[PDB]
Amino acid sequence: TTIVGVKFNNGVVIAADTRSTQGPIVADKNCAKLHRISPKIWCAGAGTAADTEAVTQLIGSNIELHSLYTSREPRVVSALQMLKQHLFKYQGHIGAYLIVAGVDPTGSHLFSIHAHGSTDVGYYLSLGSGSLAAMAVLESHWKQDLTKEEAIKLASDAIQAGIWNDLGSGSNVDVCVMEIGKDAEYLRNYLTPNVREEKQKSYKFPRGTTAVLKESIVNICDIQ
Amino acid sequence: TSIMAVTFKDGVILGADSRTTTGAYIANRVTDKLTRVHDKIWCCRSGSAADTQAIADIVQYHLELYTSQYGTPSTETAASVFKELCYENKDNLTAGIIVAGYDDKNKGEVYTIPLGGSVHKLPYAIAGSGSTFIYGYCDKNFRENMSKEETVDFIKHSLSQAIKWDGSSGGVIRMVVLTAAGVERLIFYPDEYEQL
C-alpha cells in the first residue's frame, strides 16, 4: 500500500498503489486509495482503510459546512488541526496513518499524519508497507525548484519501486495533482504496467451439468 | 532526543537536533522542535510527540486569551500552565520539555519540566533520551553573563559532542534567540560540525 506525496514549485501531487489485503491474501485488484475532503484537497490513508474512509468522508462534511458558514474557501490546515484533535481522543485504536496535501488561497501545502496525532511537514513523503523503498528513490532524484511534469514521473517511478521491490503492493497506479488557480486534475489508472494475460484455455462448462433438486420463482410484486 | 537551552547577558537561547525515530528508521530528518507559544516564549519538545503537539497547542489557547483579558504574560506563568497539564495527566502521556522567555525588567529565564511533572529553575538545561552524554562536557565549560558569540558555539560544541560519541539520535542542528530587541532562527549544517 505504497503511497507518496511531493511538492513542486507551484503545486503538489500524490499517488498510491491499488492492492488490497485481508492479510496476505488479496481482496481487490484495484481500489481508489485517494480520497476527498474538499475539491482542491485530497488525502490518502495507508493502514486500516475503514478508519481511513470515515475520516475523509466525515471531515469533508464537518468542513464543507465551515466553508459556507464562513463564506470563504477552506484551508487544508483546518483539515489537519481537527483530525489531529480527533484521533488524539482515541490515542491509537484508530488504524490510520495519512498524508494530506492541497491548495489554499495562501499557497500550497503538504502534511503527514500518524495515529496518535504526530503530524509533520515536508516537501516529500511516502508511507505504507513500502514507505522505505519509495522514500529512497525520490531521495536519489528529488531536487529543489522542481517542476510539475518532473514529479509525475519521480512520484510514479518511485511507487513502481513500491510494487516490484515490495510484497504487499500490487497492480495499478492512481494519481491526483493540483496547481494554483486551476482545477484538481485526477488521473485514474495513470499507468497499467502489468496485465492479467490469458490462461491457455477456457475451463468453463456446458449446459445440463448440475443436479437441481427443485426450482421455483420469486416475486417482487407490488400493490397490484 | 537532544535539546537544551541556556541564558546569557542580553537574552537566552534554545537549540535542538532535527531528527526523530521510530524503531531504528530515519523517518523525518528535518523536524523542528520549537514552538511559537507566544511572541517571546518558546519551548523544546522532548519525550513523545503526539502529546507535546497538543499540549503546546493548548497553551496558546490559555496564553492567547490571558494575553487579551489580563495583559502581557510572564514566563513563570507558562510552566505553571504546562505543569498543570503534565502532572494532572501524567499517567497516560510521555513528555518532558523546556521553556524560555524574557522581560525587559527581569532578564532571561529558563525552566525545565520532567516526565512526572515538576518545574525547576535552571540557567542551563538539557533533555533527551540521547542527551545524558553532556552533563560533564558542559558543567565545566559553562559560566554566566557571557554573550552571543560565546554561547552559540558552546551549544555547537555540545551537540556534536552528543552525536559524535554515541548520541544515537540527531541530525542537523538549529537554534533561535530571544533578546530584548528581536528574534531570529539560526541554522547550522552537518558539514560544519561533522569535520569539527
Binding site: 490546515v77 | 532535527s18 523536524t31 523542528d32 542537523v172
Partner: peptide
C-alpha cells in the same frame, strides 16, 4: 543533501 531544512517554519501550523 541537508540544505533545504530551513524553509520549515514549524511542525504544521506556525509562522
Amino acid at each position: 543533501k541537508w540544505d533545504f531544512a530551513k524553509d520549515i517554519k514549524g511542525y504544521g501550523t506556525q509562522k
